[PDB]
Amino acid sequence: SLKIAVTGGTGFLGQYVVESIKNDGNTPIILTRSIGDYEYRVSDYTLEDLINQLNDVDAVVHLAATRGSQGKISEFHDNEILTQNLYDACYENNISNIVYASTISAYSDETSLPWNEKELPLPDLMYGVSKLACEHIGNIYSRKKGLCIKNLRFAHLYGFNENYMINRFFRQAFHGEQLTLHANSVAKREFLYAKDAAKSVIYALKQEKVSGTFNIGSGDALTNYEVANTINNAFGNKDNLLVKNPNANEGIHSSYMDSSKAKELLDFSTDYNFATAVEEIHLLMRG
């Protein structure tokens, strides 16, 4: 029975991932900078400290990160550091079965859809650049420290109980209220249910000696019109959709991935699809 440490364990993804671990028979150990029935271990993400917070741990899921604000590369440097510390600490304790949470935001070139992991990364955001940097940090430790880091480029995560577009619809449709879309768009964006993302963490943790980079997508690229509709139906808010302006939005770009590689090497596929996932999220918002 394995002890699995989850950085950013208390986060949104983290909570899905922690329980997937417990359901798998294993033991989740939540790492966090602070708190106010799982084991929590408080840490300051220093090398010297993690060394000790990981001394009885078998695997590590590295979920902890910052989202940014200023669009400046400086807002992420603390992550990059936190990452290298973790891998340093992992090495000391002789941990190699590690999962890193990367993102679809390593891609951008619409000419190239759908993106597979041979797509030249080309981030639009400083967030992207950073994530991409932590990926190679792991890569280097993997090739040179025999660490076994599996980078997971998650598609756009959605879940239950989270002001982003998808959350707005959830809330709005839930109170029976008109969903709006600034304009119509033809752009398609891939949405991966948090439960399925925690699933892929589990399956990647199965290939304990595997090290590489995998797209974890759902299917399953939707337009904003599609998203709104599907939420609308599931929430008894049929047809309650308003398009504020005529023409194309143009503030939105397409993003989805080819997840072949994950399917064959990780033997991974999603339990849910957008409509099934939201059917369930709805049936749980009554809390």
Ligand X SMILES: O=c1ccn([C@@H]2O[C@H](COP(=O)(O)OP(=O)(O)O)[C@@H](O)[C@H]2O)c(=O)[nH]1
Interface positions with a copy of itself (CB under 8 A): 72-74, 77, 80-81, 83-84, 118, 120-126, 128-130, 132-133, 136-137, 139-140, 143-144
Is 13 a binding residue for ligand X by CB under 6 A? The answer is: yes
CB of 233 to ligand X, least distance (A): 26
Instruction: Rank residues 82 and 90 by Cβ distance to ligand X and give the closer one.
Output: 82
The residue range among 63-71, 111-119, 228-236, 243-251 that interacts with ligand X, by the rule CB under 6 A, is 63-71
Interface map 14-33 toward ligand X (x if CB under 6 A): x-----------------xx
Is 217 a binding residue for ligand X by CB under 6 A? The answer is: no
- 18 phi and psi angles, rounded to 5 deg: -60, -45
Confirm whether residue 169 is marked as ligand binding.
no
Instruction: Rank residues 125 and 183 by Cβ distance to ligand X and give the closer one.
Output: 125
The answer for residues whose C-beta is within 8 angstroms of residue 161's C-beta and 6 or more apart is: 285
Instruction: Give the integer Cα–Cα distance in Å for 170 and 135.
Output: 32
How many CB atoms within 10 Å of residue 181? Answer: 20
Alpha helices in 106-259 (DSSP H): 126-144, 165-174, 194-204, 224-234
Q: Which strands, in side-by-side order, build the sheet including 156-158?
A: 156-158, 189-193, 221-222
How many CB atoms within 10 Å of residue 5? Answer: 30
Instruction: Give the integer Cα–Cα distance in Å for 20 and 142.
Output: 25
CB of 200 to a copy of itself, least distance (A): 22
Is 101 a binding residue for ligand X by CB under 6 A? The answer is: yes
Which of ligand X, a copy of itself, none does 64 bind, CB closer than 5 to 8 A by kind? ligand X
Residue closest to ligand X, measured at CB? 11
Q: Determine the length of the chain.
A: 287
| Residue 181 near residue 245 (C-beta atoms within 8 A) | no
CB of 97 to a copy of itself, least distance (A): 22
The amino acid occupying position 9 is: G
Which of ligand X, a copy of itself, none does 28 bind, CB closer than 5 to 8 A by kind? none
| Residue 74 near residue 63 (C-beta atoms within 8 A) | no
Confirm whether residue 122 is marked as ligand binding.
no
Is 86 a binding residue for ligand X by CB under 6 A? The answer is: no
Instruction: Give the integer Cα–Cα distance in Å for 121 and 78.
Output: 22
- Known binding site for UDP: residues? 12-13, 33, 66
Residues lying near ligand X in the complex (CB under 6 A): 8, 10-14, 32-33, 63-66, 78, 82, 101
